[PDB]
Design a protein around this ligand. Sequence first.
Ligand SMILES: C=CC/C(=C\COP(=O)(O)OP(=O)(O)O)CO
Length: 187
Amino acid sequence: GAYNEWKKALFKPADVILDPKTANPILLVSEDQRSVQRAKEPQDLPDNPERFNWHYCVLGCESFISGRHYWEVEVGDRKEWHIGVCSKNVQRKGWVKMTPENGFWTMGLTDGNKYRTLTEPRTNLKLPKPPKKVGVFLDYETGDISFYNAVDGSHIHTFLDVSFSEALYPVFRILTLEPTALTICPA
Ligand SMILES: C=CC/C(=C\COP(=O)(O)OP(=O)(O)O)CO
């Protein structure tokens, strides 16, 4: 459909690979750096400045300061996941609420069937069909971050008219221990 035929004409396909130096020590990044899982217990890793030490987050390796970009994430049958973008300068040490005011523009799924945007306060989304693959779209200049069901092209949510000033990274968060990983589709 139009989603597949037009996406690359409007947005540059980003080749997103996960940065293991950023990942909370309870997360495992796959060898190909496209997939993340959770461990039962935190692994023994350095508390280097780029690493999230409280939130169960990991970033892409590259950030964006201009332009239109997109990437796609296979969420599959996971019961919990959150994805989107965040500012380079978010607080990675200690707790902050993941909200736009704190530099995070994310949405996702909790408790198997509760879709939300991570706003303040959180907003519930009503999705006709549960997505298995989600497209994340950034237009830096217009300030729009938009999420689509990447199989049927349906709209999930858009953060409108944000005034970005910092570089933006893809961000991924998983809280639960489940058999299915969260995985980036290669460009
Ligand atoms: C270690 C805390 C669990 C965690 C996130 C939960 O944060 P939260 O209670 O503010 O909930 P929410 O961000 O609304 O899902 C790791 O990213």
